[PDB]
Amino acid sequence: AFFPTPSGSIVTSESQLFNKPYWLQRAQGHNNGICWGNQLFVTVVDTTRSTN
Amino acid sequence: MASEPYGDSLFFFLRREQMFVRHFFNRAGKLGEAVPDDLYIKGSGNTAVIQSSAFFPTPSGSIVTSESQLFNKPYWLQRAQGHNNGICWGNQLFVTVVDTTRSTN
Amino acid sequence: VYLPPVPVSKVVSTDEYVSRTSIYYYAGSSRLLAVGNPYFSIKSPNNNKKVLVPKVSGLQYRVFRVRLPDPNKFGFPDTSFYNPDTQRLVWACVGLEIGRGQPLGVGVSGHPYLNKFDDTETSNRYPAQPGSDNRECLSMDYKQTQLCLIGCKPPTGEHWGKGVACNNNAAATDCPPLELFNSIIEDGDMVDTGFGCMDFGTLQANKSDVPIDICNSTCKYPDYLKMASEPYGDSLFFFLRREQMFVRHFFNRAGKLGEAVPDDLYIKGSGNTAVIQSSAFFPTPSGSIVTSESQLFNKPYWLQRAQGHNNGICWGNQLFVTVVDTTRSTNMTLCTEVTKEGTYKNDNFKEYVRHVEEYDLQFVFQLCKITLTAEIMTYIHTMDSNILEDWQFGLTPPPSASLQDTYRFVTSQAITCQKTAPPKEKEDPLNKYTFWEVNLKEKFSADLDQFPLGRKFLLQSGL
Amino acid sequence: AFFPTPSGSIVTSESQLFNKPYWLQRAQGHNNGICWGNQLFVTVVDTTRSTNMTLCTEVTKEGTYKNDNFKEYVRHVEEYDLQFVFQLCKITLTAEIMTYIHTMD
Amino acid sequence: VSRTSIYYYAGSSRLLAVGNPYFSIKSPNNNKKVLVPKVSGLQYRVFRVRLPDPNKFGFPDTSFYNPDTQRLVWACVGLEIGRGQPLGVGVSGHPYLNKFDDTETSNRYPAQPGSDNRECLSMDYKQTQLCLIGCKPPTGEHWGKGVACNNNAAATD
Amino acid sequence: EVNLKEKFSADLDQFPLGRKFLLQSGL
């Protein structure tokens, strides 16, 4: 009954994803940016900045 | 498969493989093809019997990134490699996948 | 005053006498293989010349030696492009693909009696351990390397080795000389592995500083400097290379340090430091990960310009492809038992190791015709002689006579015996070596696109 | 008081600066390649090909190993080359320029 | 400096050098000479070419310059440095390096007694390349010892 | 000291660099 233990590599700052603008041009759905009901839900999970 | 005459087992194929060694071991047991004697110099004491000279390494894989995968993207077959330009006779296909980056336990 | 040295004959590239036509011809070998032992060649006990289980590994040069059909003996349907009298025909090379078909996986070997004394990375205390024999069993990897050279003549390596000494010097320590040699690379002579490109046969008495497979063979290395510099260009058309390595541990030798470290450079020691350990460290190369984008193979390789004056043309109807590989050098393990029981003991079983290394080749040629006239026939004879014989058109009186009368005794040999020396041509210098051969006389074709390289070529040229 | 032991890394063969021609088209200083006094001064460092052999001779020959008999020497070698291509320049040496060079050296 | 269209290849012969990689060896009882010279990979190898001066040269046609009032100089327009060997990295060491403890994972302690504690260790180097071309020899820099300032009662010597 | 005193040549295309330079000149 084996189990590994995972570990992250180096976490550089050329492979970051945030702190940049993202202009929507064509979303993959049919809903091309219209937000019915006047809300959005933005979900963000990060792990590069998880110090203790 | 590619050098087949009609060319009907590939339309499209891709691969990525990587591997490096982590440890080295040796086996146990009476060695069959024994070492010749004109290649080294003998001894006595704790060097009485020659130790078994069958080594085998172990593979251990590497980091499994997501910037260099192969799946979840479309693949438009503009011109397949052989002579069948995509046409599938007899109304069947065969896709084979081998993926060992999504193989958690 | 001063004046310009002197005029000398200048070579000329084969753009300007060899003209080319548009008659392309695929060729191609079948799947070559070999199966043998990875470390040492197994010898038969009764007859000690017949090999029983041959030696093949990943690390050797696999120098092939292709053969071609003489393209003057073709019965063409239409001879309309050349008068058969004045012209000749010769094959030119414009394609290549050197496949392989075994999976990845780097291969490891070792010696049973390596010369490890202690570890010199984080702990080597004092005093030294006592003993007379302190050899242990170690394993080590190799440096990953790939290369690929085609050309009309065999490729020439180089290696160090023991050499000629000098006159008497009254304070000269015992130390062997070194000298840079030259050779022609055979099949099976090992490639280097980061221990330098030096012979291990006449330079190591204790026989105990490499793995067993190179303990008595001379690890050459190709000579890119000399082969590029020859003005005819008949030894390289195309060459690729890629290697990497890095150290894994550090190990020091065991023996009398034959040179003494001088007294000036260290504060001398007392107590438990009466003895002074060796400074002879040797590393252990290991190599790194082997991806599948840093390969050099299964990809076509067109030519339009070689790096010399020989723009592809091969005289004498042979090529010489050499490949090295240590990305695909895995070593299997076979276990045939003796008895059939239901309990393990280590003395029932039997372990023979094995190794495979297999290949493939593919070509696509082009037929180009020399116009033979007055200024050209002299020029090829300066280059070689076997070309202007083997087209079976004549023979060359080598002088028009000489100035010296040379004193031919014809009394036939009973007074002051001159060098008689009845000659014989030996028909080649190449016959002494041992090349893997592959025949392509029976395997030409004129219709390309029933083959793999025919469909990749006919898109690349836009035809 | 601490001090760290340095170490190199994976020396490739696609990250080397030798064995390939350059072509100086515009130098960073003022002169574009003129060499007064007819000498150059090239300077090469490398520590990727810093291999170190091990030679080993003997004194007695036997059929049993001991550390006593053999002597070890270390040696090392560095084989080089150079190549150049030069051009030809004429100075129109009038009355001003003879001072322009005399202040230089 | 004007320009013309007369190029001139000038290739050296290949060079070698062979010796000991740590220190030179000098013969006893003379000591002004050396048996095997110290050659290692880490040193600089400052070559120094010489060119034949183009006013004492065999030009096949001296009817492009008027030699009463002109002069000629060479100008480099290409370069290449070949080099041939394997790709092995190298090790050095010191038999009596002043290493006291290890300080990465475990140094639980009372103090350790003794007078000498030196050991034999070995490490490699930072891998480095550079090439540079001049008309004067290149000028380095390094730290060193200096004037002690001889004053103000320096508590740290 | 390397010595290029008498190793020159005026013909470019018989030397391992001289062919690589004649293609870069477009000529």
Side-chain angles (χ1 to χ4, degrees):
Chain A
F2 307 134
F3 76 109
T5 169
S7 279
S9 45
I10 72 172
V11 281
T12 171
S13 199
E14 199 64 32
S15 85
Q16 209 70 259
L17 201 41
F18 299 143
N19 265 337
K20 297 202 308 154
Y22 295 117
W23 318 125
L24 302 203
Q25 277 196 28
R26 183 181 180 273
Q28 52 94 40
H30 282 292
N31 230 14
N32 205 4
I34 308 295
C35 39
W36 307 107
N38 320 127
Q39 39 195 13
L40 312 169
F41 302 101
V42 165
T43 76
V44 172
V45 42
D46 197 333
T47 330
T48 46
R49 302 171 144 98
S50 91
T51 180
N52 287 141
Chain B
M1 290 173 176
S3 160
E4 211 273 348
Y6 279 123
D8 218 17
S9 314
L10 318 178
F11 296 163
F12 190 77
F13 85 112
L14 307 166
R15 52 169 139 82
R16 292 186 69 252
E17 295 210 352
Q18 48 180 299
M19 164 178 168
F20 77 105
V21 292
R22 186 184 291 271
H23 288 340
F24 323 102
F25 296 137
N26 56 354
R27 290 163 170 267
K30 288 160 55 54
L31 195 66
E33 289 171 28
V35 291
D37 43 353
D38 43 0
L39 262 176
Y40 65 105
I41 282 179
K42 309 167 184 177
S44 314
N46 311 334
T47 168
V49 51
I50 305 294
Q51 213 183 13
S52 276
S53 67
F55 307 119
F56 85 110
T58 170
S60 198
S62 167
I63 81 169
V64 292
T65 183
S66 171
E67 302 109 2
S68 86
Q69 279 286 344
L70 266 175
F71 295 148
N72 316 310
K73 329 192 300 187
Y75 282 125
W76 318 113
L77 314 194
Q78 282 173 51
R79 174 199 177 258
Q81 56 91 15
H83 274 304
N84 267 323
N85 211 313
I87 302 301
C88 56
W89 311 106
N91 311 328
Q92 48 189 1
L93 291 183
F94 287 98
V95 292
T96 71
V97 290
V98 180
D99 201 357
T100 169
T101 61
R102 255 70 171 264
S103 89
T104 180
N105 270 10
Chain C
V1 305
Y2 276 116
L3 80 160
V6 101
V8 83
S9 35
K10 75 175 232 108
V11 313
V12 54
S13 91
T14 76
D15 199 297
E16 273 165 359
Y17 51 93
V18 168
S19 170
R20 292 159 183 253
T21 56
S22 66
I23 324 290
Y24 298 86
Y25 269 72
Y26 177 83
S29 155
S30 63
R31 317 183 51 192
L32 307 171
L33 279 88
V35 170
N37 194 267
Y39 313 146
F40 44 88
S41 44
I42 278 298
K43 275 305 177 46
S44 57
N46 271 273
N47 195 61
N48 309 283
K49 205 184 201 306
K50 165 177 201 196
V51 289
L52 194 67
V53 187
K55 160 148 155 169
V56 60
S57 278
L59 289 88
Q60 304 169 342
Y61 288 77
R62 289 259 83 85
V63 48
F64 294 117
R65 191 212 163 173
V66 312
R67 281 280 194 178
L68 257 66
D70 190 311
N72 267 316
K73 315 168 182 171
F74 272 181
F76 282 120
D78 203 357
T79 187
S80 158
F81 48 84
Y82 84 111
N83 175 21
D85 185 39
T86 324
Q87 272 91 352
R88 284 304 213 240
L89 304 181
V90 58
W91 285 132
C93 164
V94 289
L96 192 67
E97 172 198 293
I98 313 187
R100 277 178 71 110
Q102 207 72 1
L104 294 184
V106 79
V108 64
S109 73
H111 208 276
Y113 275 171
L114 215 56
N115 217 350
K116 188 262 287 182
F117 187 32
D118 295 75
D119 181 277
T120 87
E121 176 89 324
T122 187
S123 299
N124 174 235
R125 288 201 169 161
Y126 264 119
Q129 49 188 346
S132 44
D133 196 15
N134 310 128
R135 307 163 288 153
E136 285 174 49
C137 165
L138 296 195
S139 43
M140 91 194 58
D141 328 334
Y142 296 132
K143 54 179 277 279
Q144 158 196 357
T145 166
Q146 323 199 324
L147 54 151
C148 172
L149 280 65
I150 88 170
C152 183
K153 293 303 170 38
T156 85
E158 47 92 7
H159 67 295
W160 305 105
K162 205 189 74 186
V164 56
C166 308
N167 260 355
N168 195 226
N169 207 328
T173 178
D174 40 351
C175 43
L178 315 170
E179 190 191 54
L180 189 74
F181 291 98
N182 278 164
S183 173
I184 281 179
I185 306 161
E186 278 193 355
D187 176 75
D189 39 352
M190 299 273 197
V191 77
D192 51 345
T193 320
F195 296 99
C197 48
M198 42 92 77
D199 175 78
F200 291 96
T202 69
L203 298 181
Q204 279 83 14
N206 45 2
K207 288 191 157 299
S208 302
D209 59 18
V210 279
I212 35 178
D213 46 353
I214 53 176
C215 198
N216 56 340
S217 314
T218 169
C219 319
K220 322 188 171 192
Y221 179 81
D223 196 294
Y224 302 119
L225 277 307
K226 162 162 186 38
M227 264 144 54
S229 44
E230 154 64 46
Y232 276 125
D234 277 330
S235 165
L236 280 190
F237 286 174
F238 190 67
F239 81 112
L240 272 304
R241 55 192 194 93
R242 170 187 173 91
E243 55 258 43
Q244 67 201 11
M245 49 180 296
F246 84 113
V247 280
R248 178 77 74 93
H249 318 294
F250 300 99
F251 281 139
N252 65 320
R253 295 292 187 199
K256 266 155 208 174
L257 210 68
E259 294 328 292
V261 48
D263 178 86
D264 288 312
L265 309 183
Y266 65 112
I267 294 302
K268 55 199 64 62
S270 78
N272 307 116
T273 71
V275 300
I276 288 94
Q277 302 195 39
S278 155
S279 61
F281 323 107
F282 86 116
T284 163
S286 180
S288 195
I289 74 170
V290 280
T291 83
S292 197
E293 67 266 25
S294 90
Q295 302 288 326
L296 261 295
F297 291 130
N298 315 269
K299 292 161 182 56
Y301 279 135
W302 323 108
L303 317 195
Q304 56 263 24
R305 273 158 214 133
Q307 59 103 44
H309 270 282
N310 209 25
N311 215 313
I313 318 287
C314 44
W315 323 98
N317 309 326
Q318 58 176 7
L319 311 186
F320 267 103
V321 290
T322 163
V323 299
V324 188
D325 269 310
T326 167
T327 53
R328 290 166 142 118
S329 89
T330 186
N331 283 340
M332 314 203 289
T333 298
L334 312 181
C335 274
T336 67
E337 77 275 51
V338 164
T339 174
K340 304 206 178 292
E341 218 167 357
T343 304
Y344 203 112
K345 303 160 285 172
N346 298 344
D347 287 315
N348 316 274
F349 295 115
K350 200 74 67 167
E351 300 98 15
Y352 324 111
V353 297
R354 280 303 204 259
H355 169 90
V356 197
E357 159 165 271
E358 57 99 11
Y359 284 100
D360 189 294
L361 281 94
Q362 271 149 33
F363 292 85
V364 42
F365 292 110
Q366 185 180 53
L367 184 133
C368 44
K369 42 143 184 183
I370 296 166
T371 287
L372 179 47
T373 322
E375 291 94 3
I376 302 159
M377 45 79 92
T378 163
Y379 172 54
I380 319 172
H381 181 264
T382 41
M383 174 186 323
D384 276 329
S385 54
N386 316 330
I387 304 154
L388 273 193
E389 288 202 13
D390 206 86
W391 295 339
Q392 268 304 126
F393 96 113
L395 170 140
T396 59
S400 64
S402 63
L403 86 173
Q404 292 177 335
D405 304 336
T406 70
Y407 328 138
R408 191 257 302 261
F409 287 72
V410 75
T411 172
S412 309
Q413 289 89 54
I415 36 130
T416 57
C417 299
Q418 60 272 6
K419 284 313 298 303
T420 59
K424 290 179 179 179
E425 295 177 350
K426 280 80 54 190
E427 302 151 6
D428 49 354
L430 306 158
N431 221 48
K432 275 91 66 179
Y433 314 102
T434 164
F435 299 140
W436 190 339
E437 195 143 338
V438 48
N439 201 320
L440 261 65
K441 281 151 167 168
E442 301 158 341
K443 310 288 184 40
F444 274 9
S445 153
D447 221 356
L448 286 95
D449 50 355
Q450 281 78 253
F451 293 112
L453 259 284
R455 296 163 317 228
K456 303 195 208 163
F457 185 84
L458 283 187
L459 261 67
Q460 193 268 347
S461 159
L463 304 192
Chain D
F2 324 109
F3 83 116
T5 164
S7 176
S9 277
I10 307 185
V11 44
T12 83
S13 199
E14 57 267 42
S15 45
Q16 274 195 346
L17 277 306
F18 304 136
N19 298 304
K20 40 181 296 181
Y22 309 112
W23 314 104
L24 319 176
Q25 314 164 32
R26 170 64 150 82
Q28 45 90 11
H30 269 298
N31 50 343
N32 306 1
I34 310 298
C35 40
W36 313 104
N38 321 111
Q39 54 184 5
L40 305 196
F41 269 98
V42 308
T43 290
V44 176
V45 193
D46 195 337
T47 169
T48 54
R49 311 176 142 94
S50 88
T51 173
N52 274 333
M53 317 187 183
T54 292
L55 309 188
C56 187
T57 48
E58 52 96 18
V59 166
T60 170
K61 55 170 305 159
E62 277 185 4
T64 308
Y65 204 111
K66 294 184 183 69
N67 77 285
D68 317 332
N69 324 291
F70 316 99
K71 276 185 173 199
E72 297 108 316
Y73 319 124
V74 288
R75 291 293 183 277
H76 171 88
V77 55
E78 283 279 41
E79 163 183 355
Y80 276 93
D81 199 304
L82 286 94
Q83 281 157 50
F84 291 92
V85 164
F86 296 141
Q87 205 182 8
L88 197 85
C89 325
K90 46 173 182 178
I91 295 189
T92 308
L93 187 142
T94 184
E96 282 86 3
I97 296 153
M98 305 169 48
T99 37
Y100 201 102
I101 309 171
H102 188 222
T103 172
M104 281 173 46
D105 200 346
Chain E
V1 170
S2 164
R3 280 295 171 99
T4 50
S5 64
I6 316 294
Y7 307 93
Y8 265 88
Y9 175 86
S12 166
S13 155
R14 95 164 80 179
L15 283 80
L16 277 77
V18 45
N20 192 281
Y22 296 168
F23 41 84
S24 62
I25 275 178
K26 320 218 182 192
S27 155
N29 75 62
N30 207 313
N31 305 271
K32 299 297 174 180
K33 76 187 300 177
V34 279
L35 278 186
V36 277
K38 166 173 157 157
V39 167
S40 166
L42 271 71
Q43 322 197 319
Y44 295 79
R45 306 261 157 254
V46 192
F47 305 143
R48 182 194 175 184
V49 311
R50 307 216 174 246
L51 322 171
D53 311 63
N55 307 97
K56 309 169 184 153
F57 212 64
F59 273 37
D61 194 1
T62 70
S63 291
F64 66 99
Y65 79 103
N66 195 358
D68 50 345
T69 180
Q70 276 151 33
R71 273 306 189 256
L72 305 177
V73 282
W74 290 130
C76 162
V77 79
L79 196 141
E80 172 271 352
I81 298 164
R83 180 169 165 84
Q85 210 55 30
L87 259 284
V89 303
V91 193
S92 299
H94 197 298
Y96 277 148
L97 186 143
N98 193 42
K99 186 256 285 180
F100 182 40
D101 298 340
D102 165 72
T103 168
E104 50 184 297
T105 178
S106 158
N107 209 317
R108 299 192 48 81
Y109 84 107
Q112 179 178 12
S115 194
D116 59 354
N117 294 137
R118 314 178 283 203
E119 293 187 23
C120 172
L121 269 304
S122 60
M123 77 284 287
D124 64 331
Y125 294 130
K126 41 187 290 284
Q127 71 91 16
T128 315
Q129 325 182 0
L130 60 151
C131 86
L132 65 158
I133 294 101
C135 201
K136 309 299 181 183
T139 84
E141 59 158 28
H142 60 288
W143 300 101
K145 208 179 75 174
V147 161
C149 187
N150 69 86
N151 220 10
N152 290 55
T156 77
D157 306 64
Chain F
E1 183 154 3
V2 84
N3 181 34
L4 262 64
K5 186 72 57 57
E6 273 296 354
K7 301 286 192 43
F8 271 40
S9 154
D11 258 347
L12 264 176
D13 50 350
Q14 283 77 243
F15 292 108
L17 208 86
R19 279 164 316 234
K20 269 176 215 144
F21 174 64
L22 263 177
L23 307 181
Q24 206 268 347
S25 156
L27 172 63

